[PDB]
């Protein structure tokens, strides 16, 4: 429980305040959430406008609070399609000061247009699985089912 008690302490003190997806070419926010999708043990749902599939790049912005210090806060994200892994991403934030609020921005580039999946094939069939870690320590795993509308 030693590492498990610490993971629980971090999770209990951790909150996603807000998150945005922004078209990096226009600067326009496409999608905004205020729900804490770090919360495990529930299948979250998100509806995103299907025009996100035509973006060359999307700026992802997350604002999070952490009571607990983290040495090397990072995310692993798997994109599952009808239960099959299509892409896996790794994002590193690094040191988190205890009881800080933090904005974390990442630019996610689109595959060439010819490789992008159609909205009608994707919608309802995509799960994003996010593992939140401090270094080696798994703090939380959350799942979000994506609809393209």
């Amino acid at each position: 429980s030693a590492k498990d008690e610490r993971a629980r302490e971090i999770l209990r003190g951790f909150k996603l305040n807000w998150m945005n997806l922004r078209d990096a070419e226009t600067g326009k926010i496409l999608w905004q959430g205020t729900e804490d999708l770090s919360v495990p043990g529930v299948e979250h749902e998100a509806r995103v406008p299907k025009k996100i599939l035509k973006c060359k790049a999307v700026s992802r912005e997350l604002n999070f609070s952490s009571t607990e210090q983290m040495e090397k806060f990072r995310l692993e994200q798997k994109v599952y399609f009808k239960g099959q892994c299509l892409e896996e991403w790794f994002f590193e934030f690094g040191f988190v000061i205890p009881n800080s609020t933090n904005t974390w921005q990442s630019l996610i580039e689109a595959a060439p247009e010819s490789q992008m999946m159609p909205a009608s094939v994707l919608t309802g069939n995509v799960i994003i699985e996010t593992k939140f870690f401090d270094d080696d320590l798994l703090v939380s795993t959350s799942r979000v089912r994506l609809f393209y509308v």
Binding site: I52, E87, E109, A110, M116, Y148
Partner: peptide, 5 residues
């Protein structure tokens, strides 16, 4: 590494 979305 690019996304397919």
């Amino acid at each position: 590494s690019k996304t397919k979305c």
